[PDB]
Design a protein around this nucleic acid. Sequence first.
RNA 1: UUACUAAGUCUCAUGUACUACAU
RNA 2: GUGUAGUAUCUGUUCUUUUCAGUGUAACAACUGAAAUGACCUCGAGGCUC
Lengths: 188, 25, 444
Amino acid sequence: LSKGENVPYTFQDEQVRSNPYIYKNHSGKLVCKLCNTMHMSWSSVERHLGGKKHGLNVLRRGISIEKXXXXXXXXXXXXXXXXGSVGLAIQVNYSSEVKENSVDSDDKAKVPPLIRIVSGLELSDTKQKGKKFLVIAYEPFENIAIELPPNEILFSENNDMDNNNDGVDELNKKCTFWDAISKLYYVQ
Amino acid sequence: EGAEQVDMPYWLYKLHGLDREYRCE
Amino acid sequence: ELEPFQKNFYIESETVSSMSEMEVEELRLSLDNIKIKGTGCPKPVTKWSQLGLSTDTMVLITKLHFGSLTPIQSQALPAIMSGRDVIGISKTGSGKTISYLLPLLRQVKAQRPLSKHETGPMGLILAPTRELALQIHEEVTKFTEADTSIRSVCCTGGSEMKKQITDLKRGTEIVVATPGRFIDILTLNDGKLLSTKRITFVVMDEADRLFDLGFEPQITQIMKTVRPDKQCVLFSATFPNKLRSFAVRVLHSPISITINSKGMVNENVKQKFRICHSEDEKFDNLVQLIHERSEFFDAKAIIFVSSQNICDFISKKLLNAGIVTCAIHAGKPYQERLMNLEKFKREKNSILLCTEVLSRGLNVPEVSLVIIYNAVKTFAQYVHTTGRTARGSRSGTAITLLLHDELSGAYILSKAMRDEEIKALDPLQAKELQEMSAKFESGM
RNA sequence: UUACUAAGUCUCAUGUACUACAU
RNA sequence: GUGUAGUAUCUGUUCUUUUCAGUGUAACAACUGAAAUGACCUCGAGGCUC
């Protein structure tokens, strides 16, 4: 059952071993140095190797081994209404190929204007606050804001049928249009 | 539409004392 | 006072029921030498459609099983669907599982549903290992999936008991189990979570293994809580004495089905062939054979031919060439048949010349050489002709002279010869044989 | 740099000792 | 160099009805009794749920 292999004694001061684990101590018995278990016969040794006990100690031993031009554009606010409530609509116009003739290197040129709702709680001056602003931004031109005293207007409920191209946010895809051919940004 | 393909210690954990979930307050 | 129930759900298709007995023998020989024991065995089927299964099931199966019915399926399906107790000896991977599942599904389906107070099951399948039980139960589910009137629960060891108890709470029409776990579940809680009272069908698969893994006590006790008019089938790759003994104890009028246990022809018979290209060449070989034999000098031979006209011709032919034969066929007056038979049994190293049809009944002792001059066309006729030389240790040699065009004849030889018999002959003859047989086989 | 604790019960097998009892 | 009965000790293997109440226990363990069925929600856990 030993398959003719020679297992040297533990005290013989270590030829490569099949398993460098099962040894024979000062006595004739066979032992697993990791498991610290004594085994009478080589059959018992093979039961030990095929047993889950020895394997667990092998995994434990492996774990031990591992151990900006700012130019104000022109806005055109206008009180709108549909059905069934009231909403706001803004018409922002941009340059007429006047200065954009020097910059055309596909650097976010494909990116349309972006809007975000900002709380006045944070300002460069920090004096008064308590209302929101519908900020609109484009790379070269300067940012623009619109005060929204009303807690909620035109804040709709599942307008479209839940299609998921987040773009920037639900606000932008939900209610903005960018006439890039004429350079007119509508928001409502 | 558009789904195209191409081409163990059983008695030991009870003995340990997990027959009754213990708690530290 | 037991509740009566139906076990025979089999309606033999007309095309099958038209088959004669000789036809049925032949079909069994062709299906890997199916051997049966027991009385009243229904004829094997050869097509899924001869079993009268709904279209759903048909679609599903095909899907479930691809290609031709296996030999075990061909014979076990109608025997089990008929309600018979069956011993099925065949290898793992022979498709045996559906052989019992289909009839089991049918039988359980027909019974009234489990009442609000009945646990089930109606059908029980026992397996010796968790791995086999899980595999069987997976099959079952592929059928119980469509039909919500039928559940299966798999109850094995090496697995949470509480988990399986939650199942069995809800009742179940079918259980697949290892014997220990099942017995454990039966006895548990006063045996109030599982009843054996409605079990009408028990299957034991890999039955030889059940004794191997120490389950005799469990399966014996289980059969003791099951009504003795239950239908029971035992499937196993081998048939150890323990199983043989167990079957007598648990089965009624069993039909045993064994697939190609031994060879169709006695393994001591040396089967050979020679492929020829003209009747003349066949005749040249026949003569060379008859002379050659002499250098090895009771020792007698029988040439088998296919017809009375051929027998007469070859008789005269062999005569004109210096060879005297004792010719026999049913166109000859019985008085001269007797004269030739006695001359054959009298004279040393005699040669009988006989039609293949008279082979089974010839009243002569075994001979040292059979030369089949016209390749036979059936397995049954090949067995009867070659068996004329069969004699355990003293068996001789059977040689077929085959013609290039005799495709069905090659099919028979390729199926009845031992692999090592085909190896010892010329590799080109061998190659032609296999080509001939393949062509015939795709010819259908 | 890993801050020091694992086998138990059952089942069916193997390892090894032993105790009365007979040639 | 044997046989009858019987014992002890390794090792392998494996986790027995999910719960409740009583006995029991240092606490366990173990033992003693019964048994839910159905629906729903979030990530085997969870419910002043019905």
